[PDB]
Amino acid sequence: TDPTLEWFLSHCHIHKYPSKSTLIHQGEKAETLYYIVKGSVAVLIKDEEGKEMILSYLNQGDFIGELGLFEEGQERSAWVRAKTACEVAEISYKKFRQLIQVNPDILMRLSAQMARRLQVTSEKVGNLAFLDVTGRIAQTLLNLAKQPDAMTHPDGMQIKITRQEIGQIVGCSRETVGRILKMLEDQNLISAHGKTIVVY
Amino acid sequence: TDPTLEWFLSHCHIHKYPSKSTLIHQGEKAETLYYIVKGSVAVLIKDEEGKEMILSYLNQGDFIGELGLFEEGQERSAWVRAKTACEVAEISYKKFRQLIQVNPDILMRLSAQMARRLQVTSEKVGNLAFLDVTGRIAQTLLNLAKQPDAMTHPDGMQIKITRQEIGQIVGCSRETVGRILKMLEDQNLISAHGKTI
Ligand SMILES: Nc1ncnc2c1ncn2[C@@H]1O[C@@H]2COP(=O)(O)O[C@H]2[C@H]1O
Ligand SMILES: Nc1ncnc2c1ncn2[C@@H]1O[C@@H]2COP(=O)(O)O[C@H]2[C@H]1O
Ligand SMILES: Nc1ncnc2c1ncn2[C@@H]1O[C@@H]2COP(=O)(O)O[C@H]2[C@H]1O
Ligand SMILES: Nc1ncnc2c1ncn2[C@@H]1O[C@@H]2COP(=O)(O)O[C@H]2[C@H]1O
């Protein structure tokens, strides 16, 4: 076990969220912090007309809703949706702050995650500003081929994801994804036989 | 001022930097945390064609080069360049990690900034994914119209920014900025002296 994590979790109250549930609504009052004990979620934002973009995938071990923690009166900056059934620990910002004074390590862990997320979203700004849709898709296929849920393949790496998701990640239609995925197969960069894609 | 910052700074070595100097180079090994005591800088990234984009402007009171602090063996994720004459404090991650345990309030101030930056950078992703160039420039102008150095012109808010800088923030050429600034001017909501609009 991890003494610090277990120490922290003992000050939290756990709850469950079924797949497709919305844990955090954008615009909502930020006053609580979350910690994914089990499961995975998606962090989403939207344009004026319902188009959704996935900012990130968070998983077991990741903190959520930390952005309103250092300043009161702030609202949630995005929507968080359960991809799979989730077990989440929740604690008020007030209590977490008291825990910080007790052992700063817990904030160091939270901050490390914030730093990673900043690095990743910054690279996201890069892809959106410098690459055409073909480049973003190809870059996203390579990215996923490194994540944990990524498997090993005799011809490379295998991943499980739908065209809709790819679209929400790179900012394009599922049909555009479908067409681009095929063109990348003709370029012998990947192999698409189902929602499973083999990347070389 | 405040005891916490003075205390923190008393443990730092302060230095001055000319207006166009590079404080941080992307890819370098990270073992140093910086704090802007005076002046301002630009955070940048580049594409494989040399084109640069401004991820953010940082100013007095802002920590910089903090992303490599939470884990060993990390490299700078971007270039940080002074936009004006700077006065920057610095300190080893090793010694900062000790100050954190003596008084976590200093870590709270740094993390507070990381949070804001993540919100702002996430908003940048939205702008790039959902708005056309004209929309991005228009929003960028409104944004700058609240920044540190935003004059109080009678017709509204006055700012100072080059076409090139506008281009680097929204992601387009300075020629496209010029044309669109012209359009925004024929319509309205143009208070930039960067080049007069
Ligand atoms: N760019 C991002 N990358 C990862 N997680 C994010 C990003 N933007 C927002 N979030 C998370 O989504 C949450 C939405 O509500 P909060 O602002 O409380 O906290 C936010 C973060 O935990
Ligand atoms: N610029 C964009 N153009 C089109 N769809 C986008 C864009 N940015 C995000 N999306 C979203 O990504 C989704 C991909 O699958 P859909 O076609 O079902 O719906 C799409 C939109 O919700
Ligand atoms: N999106 C961003 N917003 C603000 N500052 C950033 C951003 N990305 C990188 N930086 C700064 O640029 C630095 C580059 O790598 P560092 O680890 O030095 O720490 C980073 C931050 O201080
Ligand atoms: N997608 C892009 N298209 C054009 N210029 C860009 C883009 N992204 C960033 N830039 C930069 O923004 C700068 C604006 O001024 P310049 O035209 O001199 O040079 C431009 C490039 O360096």
From Swiss-Prot, chain B:
Q: Which GO terms describe its molecular function?
A: cAMP binding; DNA binding, bending; DNA-binding transcription factor activity; identical protein binding; minor groove of adenine-thymine-rich DNA binding; sequence-specific DNA binding
Q: Which domain of life is it from?
A: Bacteria
Q: What is the effect of changing residue 77 to R?
A: Prevents SpfP from blocking galactose operon induction by CRP
What would changing residue 179 to L do, according to UniProt?
Marginally reduced DNA-binding
List the residue ranges of the region (Activating region 3 (AR3)).
46-52
What ranges does the record give for the region Activating region 2 (AR2), renumbered to this chain? 13-15
Which PROSITE patterns does the UniProt record give?
A: CNMP_BINDING_1, CNMP_BINDING_2, CNMP_BINDING_3, HTH_CRP_1, HTH_CRP_2
- Amino-acid positions noted as binding 3',5'-cyclic AMP 1 in the UniProt annotation, renumbered to this chain: 50-56, 65-67, 76-77, 121-122
GO biological process terms held by the UniProt record: carbon catabolite repression of transcription; DNA-templated transcription; negative regulation of DNA-templated transcription; positive regulation of DNA-templated transcription
* Result after altering residue 153 to A/K/L/N/P/Q/R/Y: Disrupts AR1. Decreased transcription activation (3-45%) at class I and II promoters, binds DNA
Q: What is the effect of changing residue 106 to L?
A: In strain CA8404; a CAP* phenotype, insensitive to catabolite repression
Q: Which Gene3D superfamilies match?
A: Jelly Rolls, Winged helix-like DNA-binding domain superfamily/Winged helix DNA-binding domain
Q: What is the effect of changing residue 76 to L?
A: Loss of cAMP-binding
Q: What positions does the entry give for 3',5'-cyclic AMP 2 binding?
A: 129-130, 164-174
Q: What is the effect of changing residue 15 to A/L?
A: Decreased transcription activation at class II promoters, decreased interaction with RNAP, binds DNA
Show the segment(s) annotated as Activating region 1 (AR1).
147-156
DNA-binding region located at which positions? 173-179
Arranged from A to Z, the UniProt key words for this protein are:
Acetylation, Activator, cAMP, cAMP-binding, DNA-binding, Nucleotide-binding, Repressor, Transcription, Transcription regulation
A Pfam family found in this protein is: HTH_Crp_2
Q: Name one GO cellular component term.
A: protein-DNA complex
How the protein assembles, per its UniProt entry?
Answer: Homodimer, which upon binding cAMP is able to bind DNA. AR1 of the upstream subunit binds to the C-terminus of RNAP subunit RpoA, AR2 of the downstream subunit binds to the N-terminus of RpoA while AR3 binds to sigma-70 (rpoD). Interacts with SpfP.
Record text about domains? The N-terminal domain binds cAMP and is responsible for homodimerization, while the C-terminal domain binds DNA when cAMP is bound.
Q: Which NCBIfam families match?
A: PRK11753.1
| The protein, known as | DNA-binding transcriptional dual regulator CRP
Give the originating organism: Escherichia coli (strain K12)
